[PDB]
Amino acid sequence: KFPRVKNWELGSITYDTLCAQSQQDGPCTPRRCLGSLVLPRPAEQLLSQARDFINQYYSSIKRSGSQAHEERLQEVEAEVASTGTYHLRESELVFGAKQAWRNAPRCVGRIQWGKLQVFDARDCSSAQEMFTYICNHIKYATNRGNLRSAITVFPQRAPGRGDFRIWNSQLVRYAGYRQQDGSVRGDPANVEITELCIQHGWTPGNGRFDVLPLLLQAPDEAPELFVLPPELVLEVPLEHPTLEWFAALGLRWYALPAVSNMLLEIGGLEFSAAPFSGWYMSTEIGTRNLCDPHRYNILEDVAVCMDLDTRTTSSLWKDKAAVEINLAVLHSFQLAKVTIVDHHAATVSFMKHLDNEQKARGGCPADWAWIVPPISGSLTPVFHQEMVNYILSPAFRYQPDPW
Amino acid sequence: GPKFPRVKNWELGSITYDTLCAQSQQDGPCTPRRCLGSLVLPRPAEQLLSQARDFINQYYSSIKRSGSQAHEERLQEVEAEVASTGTYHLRESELVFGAKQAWRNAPRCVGRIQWGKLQVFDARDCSSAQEMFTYICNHIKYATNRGNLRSAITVFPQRAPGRGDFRIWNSQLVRYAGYRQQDGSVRGDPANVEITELCIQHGWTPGNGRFDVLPLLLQAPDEAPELFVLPPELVLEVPLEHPTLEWFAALGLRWYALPAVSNMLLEIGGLEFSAAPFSGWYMSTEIGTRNLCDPHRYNILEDVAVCMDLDTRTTSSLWKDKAAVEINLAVLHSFQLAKVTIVDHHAATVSFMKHLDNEQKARGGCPADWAWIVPPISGSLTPVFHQEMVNYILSPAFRYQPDPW
Numbered sequence: 001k002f003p004r005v006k007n008w009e010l011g012s013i014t015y016d017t018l019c020a021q022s023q024q025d026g027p028c029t030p031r032r033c034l035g036s037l038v039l040p041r042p043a044e045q046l047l048s049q050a051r052d053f054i055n056q057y058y059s060s061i062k063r064s065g066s067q068a069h070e071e072r073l074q075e076v077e078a079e080v081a082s083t084g085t086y087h088l089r090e091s092e093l094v095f096g097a098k099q100a101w102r103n104a105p106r107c108v109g110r111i112q113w114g115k116l117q118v119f120d121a122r123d124c125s126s127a128q129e130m131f132t133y134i135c136n137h138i139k140y141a142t143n144r145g146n147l148r149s150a151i152t153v154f155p156q157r158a159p160g161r162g163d164f165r166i167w168n169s170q171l172v173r174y175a176g177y178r179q180q181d182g183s184v185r186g187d188p189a190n191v192e193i194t195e196l197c198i199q200h201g202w203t204p205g206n207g208r209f210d211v212l213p214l215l216l217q218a219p220d221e222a223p224e225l226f227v228l229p230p231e232l233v234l235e236v237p238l239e240h241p242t243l244e245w246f247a248a249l250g251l252r253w254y255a256l257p258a259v260s261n262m263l264l265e266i267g268g269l270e271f272s273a274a275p276f277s278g279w280y281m282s283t284e285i286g287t288r289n290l291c292d293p294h295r296y297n298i299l300e301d302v303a304v305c306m307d308l309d310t311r312t313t314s315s316l317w318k319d320k321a322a323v324e325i326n327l328a329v330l331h332s333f334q335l336a337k338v339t340i341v342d343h344h345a346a347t348v349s350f351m352k353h354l355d356n357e358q359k360a361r362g363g364c365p366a367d368w369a370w371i372v373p374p375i376s377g378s379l380t381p382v383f384h385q386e387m388v389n390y391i392l393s394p395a396f397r398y399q400p401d402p403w
Numbered sequence: 404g405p406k407f408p409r410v411k412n413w414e415l416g417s418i419t420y421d422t423l424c425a426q427s428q429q430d431g432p433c434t435p436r437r438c439l440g441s442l443v444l445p446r447p448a449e450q451l452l453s454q455a456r457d458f459i460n461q462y463y464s465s466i467k468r469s470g471s472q473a474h475e476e477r478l479q480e481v482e483a484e485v486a487s488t489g490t491y492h493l494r495e496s497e498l499v500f501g502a503k504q505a506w507r508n509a510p511r512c513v514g515r516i517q518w519g520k521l522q523v524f525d526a527r528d529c530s531s532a533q534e535m536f537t538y539i540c541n542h543i544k545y546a547t548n549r550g551n552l553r554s555a556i557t558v559f560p561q562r563a564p565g566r567g568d569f570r571i572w573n574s575q576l577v578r579y580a581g582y583r584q585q586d587g588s589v590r591g592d593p594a595n596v597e598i599t600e601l602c603i604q605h606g607w608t609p610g611n612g613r614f615d616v617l618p619l620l621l622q623a624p625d626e627a628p629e630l631f632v633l634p635p636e637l638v639l640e641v642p643l644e645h646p647t648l649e650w651f652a653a654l655g656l657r658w659y660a661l662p663a664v665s666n667m668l669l670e671i672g673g674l675e676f677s678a679a680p681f682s683g684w685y686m687s688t689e690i691g692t693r694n695l696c697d698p699h700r701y702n703i704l705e706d707v708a709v710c711m712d713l714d715t716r717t718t719s720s721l722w723k724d725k726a727a728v729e730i731n732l733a734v735l736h737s738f739q740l741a742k743v744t745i746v747d748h749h750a751a752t753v754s755f756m757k758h759l760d761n762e763q764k765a766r767g768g769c770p771a772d773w774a775w776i777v778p779p780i781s782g783s784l785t786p787v788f789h790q791e792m793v794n795y796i797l798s799p800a801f802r803y804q805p806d807p808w
């Protein structure tokens with residue numbers, strides 16, 4: 001019933017009781033574990049998720065069972081019974097957004113969960129207005145390099161009509177331009193979205209780091225194109241503390257990691273556009289973005305610069321260059337005074353979060369394959385920590401590309 | 404698509420469906436309410452016979468004789484044996500088959516491209532702790548092959564009803580001692596403090612070093628375990644040095660050549676072999692990263708980074724990452740110099756992807772534990788990191804078993 005959860009470095013043991021409040025099945029069965037898969041394959045129902053949520057909200061502010069709780073539960077019942085849906089009060093939405101972040105099993109950054117600026121954009125009626133809200137968020141979150149976690153919440157889904165959606169997967173991404181020779185200039189992850197921008201009338205650059213425009217979509221309307229003003233997009237040239245030639249690679253990255261394609265579910269309501277941002281953990285940039293073979297794939301170039309023996313795997317030229325590249329990212333961000341966190345500091349803060357959550361809630365849903373960093377896994381303490389993974393609501397969900 | 408798990412490689416974009424998981428006859432620890440995939444330990448005639456039948460069917464499938472006279476007669480022979488003794492016995496070739504099948508089925512092993520090349524030593528005649536010793540010594544000699552390592556397994560007698568187990572108390576055939584100091588600290592391998600204490604209790608005169616080879620504690624049925632020292636000429640070791648960092652040799656680090664697991668149960672057709680030590684060769688990260696850098700093992704990261712003169716006072720200098728890479732290279736280099744078979748984590752993972760394709764063709768899937776397959780440094784630098792994996796239990800299997808004390 002209650003899983004035993006052991007840390008193998010320290011020999012300590014906890015029991016997860018939080019998992020009993022999961023209401024939403026994941027992909028594993030007793031016959032086989034699918035825990036490493038990236039994606040998953042009435043009024044009574046909305047009402048009960050709404051009650052549960054309101055219960056969570058009044059509990060959080062310590063007024064469980066009180067007057068304001070009783071009447072707010074009746075407001076929800078009255079609204080759903082009449083309209084098939086209801087609406088959140090702002091402070092509720094703020095609570096839900098933080099709770100969704102808290103509950104996110106793939107997030108190593110959850111120590112910060114209680115510190116989230118929530119912009120309410122549910123009074124948005126157009127893509128123009130979405131653009132304005134998005135520019136505000138970017139300006140806020142960036143704060144001249146002193147990054148600040150934020151979320152902007154656009155209008156919820158409604159049974160009648162199409163969704164508010166942001167087509168881009170992050171507010172800030174680099175174009176990927178397919179070439180005659182089947183090569184890719186820029187970021188291979190963004191070939192499709194680059195091609196869509198072109199198709200909706202963007203004139204493209206030809207660089208390797210062309211900040212993409214936003215395609216924003218109000219209900220049942222074609223998406224519209226909006227060019228981010230280059231002054232709002234904070235970027236960081238990559239140089240390396242000791243390697244002089246590294247800067248001549250002309251590599252760079254943008255400061256603001258801002259997911260724009262995930263759905264935010266609260267009390268059974270669904271927010272199809274709810275972009276959120278915090279700050280990067282360096283391995284995301286240094287290892288995945290620059291070194292993955294299906295991204296910028298720079299490992300070989302770098303190793304050759306460092307004059308390593310590229311001919312054989314056993315010289316560990318890949319591991320050596322991977323580290324220098326991560327070092328360059330950290331150094332460059334620290335130099336440009338932009339918030340960044342290395343994977344040692346992040347995973348250490350995660351362990352503490354585990355401990356806080358154990359005391360507060362009786363556990364913490366966590367996805368081991370995503371929490372453990374993509375280089376130096378076992379050098380981090382999360383590696384030696386068993387984790388229980390399950391779905392709590394409020395939640396972020398992955399959603400289908402709108403096209 | 405199909406009603407079976409869809410499996411995606413995110414680097415290449417390729418998709419497969421695992422149909423093999425349908426063959427799984429034992430539940431793991433996951434439910435739809437929660438994934439317990441990252442836990443290291445998760446926890447009569449009728450039951451036996453049906454597991455036996457299934458194994459015999461496996462055996463006849465693999466020789467292409469499903470449905471044949473010999474197949475049905477063997478089945479009939481297995482039921483008659485269980486009808487009259489409550490147990491049964493494998494033919495020699497059935498043991499060879501099931502041993503290899505258990506290795507093939509091991510979700511946590513990245514070395515499985517080799518599954519077909521296993522030397523199976525049949526030791527089911529073994530009848531004393533002294534004879535266990537001889538068998539183990541022969542396995543170690545054969546497997547080590549002066550550095551040209553060869554995969555092998557030695558199978559001692561199976562569990563019997565009311566009769567005690569053959570057991571090897573050591574978790575591996577070669578491990579280093581860990582001595583508890585009056586400092587509180589440990590000299591040697593902290594992983595082995597308990598088994599060390601047990602050896603001294605059963606009469607071992609202990610050493611004083613960081614790399615003292617442990618004696619074997621071997622247990623024949625219903626006897627207390629007996630103590631056996633491996634003659635040093637038998638235990639091949641590799642002194643550690645770095646290709647370019649000249650002072651590394653001066654650290655006096657070393658490791659042994661033969662990774663030989665000895666505490667695992669081998670289950671075949673409901674039969675349980677409590678003592679069937681098996682051995683292969685190392686993947687370099689097991690030594691360079693886990694045994695040498697785990698905080699709860701030798702923990703040498705800081706010492707090495709001090710030698711390398713890194714800034715150990717801040718996390719963002721990536722001093723841990725840099726030292727770990729040099730240690731790992733030291734391991735590879737020293738094994739290659741000494742001409743002892745080793746494989747780096749890149750070659751290993753490349754070859755496992757090749758094994759995945761092979762098994763897809765052969766059996767329609769491959770049970771694999773992503774958290775264990777991905778190496779403990781440089782994860783996403785290896786192709787397995789980008790490969791979804793389905794984990795499930797097939798039989799024949801190796802199981803972990805509770806320490807016999």
Ligand code: HEM
Nearest residue numbers: 101104106107108109112149150276277278279280281396
């Ligand atoms: C404050 C600094 C933060 C750090 C260092 C951080 C760190 C990370 C990392 C490393 C991942 C996995 C990244 C990947 O490989 O794709 C992740 C995932 C995630 N984080 Fe955070 N996070 C932060 C803030 C936030 C905030 C503000 C939110 C939302 C309010 C959030 C919600 C999520 C969610 C929903 C995922 C899963 C995304 C997916 O499945 O693609 N995190 N985080």
Ligand code: HEM
Nearest residue numbers: 506509511512513514517554555681682683684685686801
């Ligand atoms: C041929 C060279 C081999 C290589 C490179 C190799 C590699 C590995 C590695 C790296 C692990 C994970 C070890 C750990 O982190 O503790 C492992 C686990 C395992 N391997 Fe192999 N292997 C080889 C041969 C064998 C053989 C001959 C067998 C048995 C017939 C075997 C069966 C297993 C089993 C049962 C596990 C799981 C152990 C556990 O749960 O503690 N492998 N293998």
Ligand SMILES: Cc1cc(N)nc(C[C@@H]2CNC[C@@H]2OCCN[C@H](C)Cc2cccc(F)c2)c1
Nearest residue numbers: 038039257258259276277278279280281284398
């Ligand atoms: C198909 C698919 C499914 C899924 N669940 N996630 C993804 C996103 C895939 C998963 N790894 C890479 C890609 O996204 C990049 C998202 N990473 C952001 C930057 C994380 C982050 C970091 C710091 C602060 C934040 F707010 C968010 C894709």
Ligand SMILES: Cc1cc(N)nc(C[C@@H]2CNC[C@@H]2OCCN[C@H](C)Cc2cccc(F)c2)c1
Nearest residue numbers: 443444662663664681682683684685686689803
């Ligand atoms: C409690 C527990 C459970 C479990 N399943 N394994 C262990 C053993 C823990 C799990 N990782 C570290 C420790 O084992 C060392 C096993 N490693 C050997 C050397 C693997 C190996 C490699 C090459 C060839 C082989 F034949 C075997 C402990």
Ligand SMILES: C[C@H](O)[C@H](O)[C@H]1CNc2nc(N)[nH]c(=O)c2N1
Nearest residue numbers: 036037038369370788789790791
């Ligand atoms: C196949 C595998 O599940 C996939 O590559 C995952 C592994 N772990 C990860 N962990 C993080 N943080 N981000 C990722 O994208 C991934 N990718």
Ligand SMILES: C[C@H](O)[C@H](O)[C@H]1CNc2nc(N)[nH]c(=O)c2N1
Nearest residue numbers: 383384385386441442443774775
């Ligand atoms: C908690 C976690 O499951 C545990 O530390 C695992 C992770 N992956 C591993 N992978 C291998 N190959 N060996 C191990 O011992 C471990 N330890």
Ligand SMILES: [Zn+2]
Nearest residue numbers: 028033433438
């Ligand atoms: Zn699972």
